[PDB]
């Protein structure tokens, strides 16, 4: 619980709790605008949104690892 909610909550760029494609492509490489190859980031977020309208809410990523 604590490590996954810490990581996803820094990852949400405030977003009301939701993460989109441009937020992940900016924040992935944590020091400013560092995301170097777009294909690595696009593959990881497309496999982590299971349906969720296309942009990830906090319960999806954590139930995907933590499911209870």
Coordinates of N, CA and C in Angstrom, one line a residue:
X1 N 0.8 -1.3 0.0 CA 0.0 0.0 0.0 C 0.8 1.3 0.0
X2 N 1.6 1.7 1.0 CA 2.3 3.0 1.1 C 3.3 3.3 -0.1
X3 N 4.2 2.3 -0.5 CA 5.1 2.6 -1.7 C 4.4 2.8 -3.0
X4 N 3.3 2.1 -3.4 CA 2.5 2.2 -4.6 C 1.7 3.5 -4.5
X5 N 1.0 3.9 -3.4 CA 0.2 5.2 -3.3 C 1.2 6.4 -3.4
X6 N 2.4 6.3 -2.7 CA 3.5 7.3 -2.8 C 3.9 7.6 -4.3
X7 N 4.3 6.5 -5.0 CA 4.7 6.6 -6.5 C 3.6 7.1 -7.4
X8 N 2.4 6.4 -7.5 CA 1.3 6.9 -8.3 C 0.9 8.4 -8.0
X9 N 0.7 8.8 -6.7 CA 0.4 10.1 -6.3 C 1.4 11.2 -6.7
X10 N 2.8 10.9 -6.7 CA 3.8 11.9 -7.3 C 3.5 11.9 -8.8
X11 N 3.3 10.7 -9.5 CA 3.0 10.6 -10.9 C 1.8 11.4 -11.4
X12 N 0.7 11.5 -10.7 CA -0.5 12.3 -11.0 C -0.1 13.8 -10.9
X13 N 0.0 14.5 -12.0 CA 0.4 16.0 -12.0 C -0.8 16.9 -11.5
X14 N -1.2 16.5 -10.3 CA -2.4 17.0 -9.5 C -3.6 16.2 -10.1
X15 N -3.9 16.3 -11.4 CA -5.0 15.7 -12.2 C -6.3 15.2 -11.6
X16 N -6.8 15.7 -10.4 CA -8.0 15.1 -9.6 C -7.7 13.6 -9.2
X17 N -6.5 13.1 -9.3 CA -6.2 11.7 -9.1 C -5.9 11.0 -10.4
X18 N -6.1 11.6 -11.6 CA -5.9 10.9 -12.9 C -4.6 11.4 -13.6
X19 N -4.0 10.4 -14.3 CA -2.7 10.5 -15.1 C -3.0 10.3 -16.6
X20 N -2.6 11.2 -17.4 CA -2.8 11.2 -18.9 C -1.4 10.8 -19.7
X21 N -1.4 10.8 -21.0 CA -0.2 10.5 -21.8 C 0.9 11.6 -21.8
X22 N 0.5 12.9 -22.0 CA 1.5 14.0 -22.0 C 2.0 14.2 -20.5
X23 N 1.3 14.1 -19.4 CA 1.8 14.1 -18.0 C 2.9 13.0 -17.8
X24 N 2.7 11.7 -18.3 CA 3.6 10.6 -18.1 C 4.9 10.9 -19.0
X25 N 4.7 11.2 -20.3 CA 5.8 11.6 -21.2 C 6.6 12.9 -20.7
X26 N 6.2 13.7 -19.8 CA 6.9 14.8 -19.2 C 7.7 14.4 -17.9
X27 N 6.9 13.8 -16.9 CA 7.3 13.3 -15.6 C 8.1 12.0 -15.4
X28 N 8.0 11.1 -16.4 CA 8.7 9.8 -16.4 C 10.2 9.9 -16.0
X29 N 11.0 10.7 -16.7 CA 12.4 11.1 -16.3 C 12.2 12.4 -15.5
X30 N 12.0 12.1 -14.2 CA 11.8 13.0 -13.1 C 12.5 14.5 -13.0
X31 N 13.7 14.7 -13.6 CA 14.4 16.0 -13.6 C 13.9 16.8 -14.9
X32 N 12.9 17.6 -14.8 CA 12.3 18.5 -15.9 C 11.8 17.7 -17.1
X33 N 12.0 18.2 -18.3 CA 11.6 17.6 -19.6 C 12.6 16.5 -20.2
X34 N 13.1 15.6 -19.4 CA 14.0 14.5 -19.7 C 13.5 13.3 -20.5
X35 N 12.1 12.9 -20.7 CA 11.7 11.7 -21.5 C 12.3 11.6 -22.9
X36 N 13.3 10.8 -23.0 CA 14.2 10.6 -24.2 C 13.5 9.7 -25.3
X37 N 13.0 8.5 -25.2 CA 12.4 7.7 -26.3 C 10.9 7.6 -25.8
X38 N 10.0 8.0 -26.7 CA 8.5 8.0 -26.4 C 7.9 6.6 -26.5
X39 N 8.4 5.7 -27.3 CA 7.9 4.3 -27.4 C 7.9 3.5 -26.0
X40 N 9.0 3.7 -25.2 CA 9.1 3.0 -23.9 C 7.9 3.4 -22.9
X41 N 7.7 4.7 -22.8 CA 6.6 5.4 -22.0 C 5.2 5.1 -22.6
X42 N 4.9 5.2 -23.9 CA 3.6 4.8 -24.6 C 3.3 3.3 -24.3
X43 N 4.3 2.4 -24.5 CA 4.0 0.9 -24.2 C 3.7 0.7 -22.7
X44 N 4.4 1.2 -21.7 CA 4.1 1.1 -20.3 C 2.7 1.7 -19.9
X45 N 2.3 2.9 -20.3 CA 1.0 3.5 -19.9 C -0.2 2.8 -20.7
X46 N 0.0 2.4 -22.0 CA -1.1 1.6 -22.7 C -1.3 0.2 -22.0
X47 N -0.3 -0.5 -21.6 CA -0.5 -1.8 -20.8 C -1.1 -1.5 -19.3
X48 N -0.8 -0.3 -18.7 CA -1.3 0.0 -17.3 C -2.8 0.6 -17.3
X49 N -3.3 1.2 -18.4 CA -4.8 1.7 -18.4 C -5.5 0.4 -18.9
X50 N -6.3 -0.3 -18.1 CA -7.0 -1.5 -18.5 C -8.4 -1.2 -19.4
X51 N -9.0 0.0 -19.1 CA -10.2 0.5 -19.8 C -10.1 2.0 -19.3
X52 N -10.5 2.4 -18.0 CA -10.4 3.7 -17.4 C -10.6 4.9 -18.3
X53 N -11.4 4.9 -19.3 CA -11.5 6.0 -20.3 C -10.2 6.3 -21.1
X54 N -9.0 5.6 -20.9 CA -7.8 6.0 -21.6 C -6.7 6.7 -20.7
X55 N -7.1 7.4 -19.6 CA -6.2 8.1 -18.6 C -6.5 7.3 -17.3
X56 N -5.4 7.0 -16.6 CA -5.4 6.2 -15.4 C -5.7 6.9 -14.1
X57 N -6.7 6.3 -13.4 CA -7.1 6.7 -12.0 C -6.3 5.8 -11.0
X58 N -6.1 6.3 -9.8 CA -5.2 5.6 -8.8 C -5.7 4.2 -8.5
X59 N -7.0 3.8 -8.2 CA -7.4 2.4 -8.0 C -6.9 1.3 -9.0
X60 N -6.8 1.7 -10.3 CA -6.4 0.7 -11.4 C -4.9 0.2 -11.2
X61 N -3.9 1.1 -11.2 CA -2.5 0.7 -11.0 C -2.2 -0.1 -9.7
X62 N -2.7 0.4 -8.6 CA -2.5 -0.3 -7.3 C -3.4 -1.6 -7.3
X63 N -4.7 -1.7 -7.7 CA -5.3 -3.1 -7.7 C -4.6 -4.1 -8.7
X64 N -4.0 -3.5 -9.8 CA -3.2 -4.3 -10.8 C -2.0 -5.0 -10.1
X65 N -1.3 -4.3 -9.1 CA -0.3 -5.0 -8.3 C -0.9 -5.7 -7.0
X66 N -1.4 -4.8 -6.1 CA -2.1 -5.0 -4.8 C -3.5 -5.6 -4.7
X67 N -4.2 -6.1 -5.7 CA -5.7 -6.6 -5.9 C -6.7 -6.9 -4.8
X68 N -6.3 -6.9 -3.5 CA -7.2 -7.1 -2.4 C -7.6 -5.7 -1.7

